[PDB]
Amino acid sequence: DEVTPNHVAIIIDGHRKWAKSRGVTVQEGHQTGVNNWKHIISRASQLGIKLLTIWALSPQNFNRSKMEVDFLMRIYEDFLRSDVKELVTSQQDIQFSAIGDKSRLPEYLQDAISYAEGLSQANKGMHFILAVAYGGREDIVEAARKIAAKVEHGILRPDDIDEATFEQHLMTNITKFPSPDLLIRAAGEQRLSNFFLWQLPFTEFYFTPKLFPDFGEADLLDALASYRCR
Amino acid sequence: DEVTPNHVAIIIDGHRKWAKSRGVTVQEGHQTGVNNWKHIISRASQLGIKLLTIWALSPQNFNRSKMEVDFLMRIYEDFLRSDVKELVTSQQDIQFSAIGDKSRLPEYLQDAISYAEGLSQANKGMHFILAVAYGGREDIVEAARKIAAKVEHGILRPDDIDEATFEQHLMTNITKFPSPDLLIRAAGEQRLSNFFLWQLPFTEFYFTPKLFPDFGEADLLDALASYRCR
Numbered sequence A, B: 001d002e003v004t005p006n007h008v009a010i011i012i013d014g015h016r017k018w019a020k021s022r023g024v025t026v027q028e029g030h031q032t033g034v035n036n037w038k039h040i041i042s043r044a045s046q047l048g049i050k051l052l053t054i055w056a057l058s059p060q061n062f063n064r065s066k067m068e069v070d071f072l073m074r075i076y077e078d079f080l081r082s083d084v085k086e087l088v089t090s091q092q093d094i095q096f097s098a099i100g101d102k103s104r105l106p107e108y109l110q111d112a113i114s115y116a117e118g119l120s121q122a123n124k125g126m127h128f129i130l131a132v133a134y135g136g137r138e139d140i141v142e143a144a145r146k147i148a149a150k151v152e153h154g155i156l157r158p159d160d161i162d163e164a165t166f167e168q169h170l171m172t173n174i175t176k177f178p179s180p181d182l183l184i185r186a187a188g189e190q191r192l193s194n195f196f197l198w199q200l201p202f203t204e205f206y207f208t209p210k211l212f213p214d215f216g217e218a219d220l221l222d223a224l225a226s227y228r229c230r
């Protein structure tokens, strides 16, 4: 249909709460979370969603323990090496990109990223964006900075700045669907936590109490049925 | 306490639904809505909230019928002439400002605005912002434009642009609490509808099904008790 969102974005959350309640380590909470992604992605592809964004890491998250953050970075490298490789080379023909401040990830993660982006570069199936070291304020600031540089070199005048111009300097300029139709946030909190900001003026929000390690294909289906009801 | 938000913002909504269900005119839905404001404002003042923002009109709302929009503009002039005058001159000593594209309101509304802003100019009680012809994308765009002009005149260089700089060119630069701690939206929809965007990265969202003509002091209390629970 057209009652199918073009862009769906997901804030993952609840991994430590989940660990805690399972009597298990937070690293294991994280790993079980990330293991969900591939099925979520496949399911969104089957539903004819054109873009799925999973938010994996904010700039503020670099304030957690070094050990926690390093474990996440490796779990993500592993995801991009096994799971994403499968997705891009499967019949789903998924296109992979990452957005965020990549300069800020270790070299090994940056390499995993460019490998999966190269591998999937010509694919024509659903776009999958992994937003990693991505923050909405930082995106806007960085847009404003690029536009200012262009102003400084006479390439652009101040009154040329409109939404559309602004939109082309954001990190979402890699899609024609920058603005999510549907934003899903697991684990019950009702806030954006410095995810997309510019990109959300008419996005439908969907909040579930479900902890993300428990979040599956059915939970995506549920979010979509809410969406179709609005 | 400090478990009292500094800034609370409210998206009003549900007036036509309410009219419809009361068998009454939408103009009357709107009037009964706006009549709620003064008690909401007084209550927020009593609770020690430092800033309340009520969003009265978006740029997209200029797409409704001319008659509807004109009725709203007059209802707002009346609010600023009777109710706000009382609030600013009462012991609550409320400070009034309006934000948004004021150029775009009729002259009579612009005059009501400057009169209430002058009247309350030296007050020291709670700040009350009426956001009228205000849209979050437009705010960001207009910020970016001012900053670009300043770049063009050598007043600012591109790498001087940071959050803080960005924040000082937004329409919320009239407060030291630009970012709401708590955002309330009546009538059940779960979206921002092009309200604040930059200002919301850590704002707590509170959605009530209550139609705004039915929204009173108790509903503000309820939103605050949810907030204190997060």
Ligand SMILES: CC(C)=CCSP(=O)(O)OP(=O)(O)O
Pocket: A011, A012, A013, A055, A056, A057, A058, A061, A189, A191, A193
């Ligand atoms: C999805 C991740 C990367 C963003 C962080 S959600 P969080 O638990 O880090 O943020 P809050 O502390 O819940 O506002």
Ligand SMILES: CC(C)=CCSP(=O)(O)OP(=O)(O)O
Pocket: B011, B012, B013, B055, B056, B057, B058, B061, B189, B191, B193
């Ligand atoms: C509070 C007012 C001024 C903003 C508009 S809320 P709305 O009913 O105009 O917007 P939606 O159509 O519900 O997205």
Ligand SMILES: [Mg+2]
Pocket: A013, A014
């Ligand atoms: Mg968390």
Ligand SMILES: [Mg+2]
Pocket: B013, B014
């Ligand atoms: Mg409405």
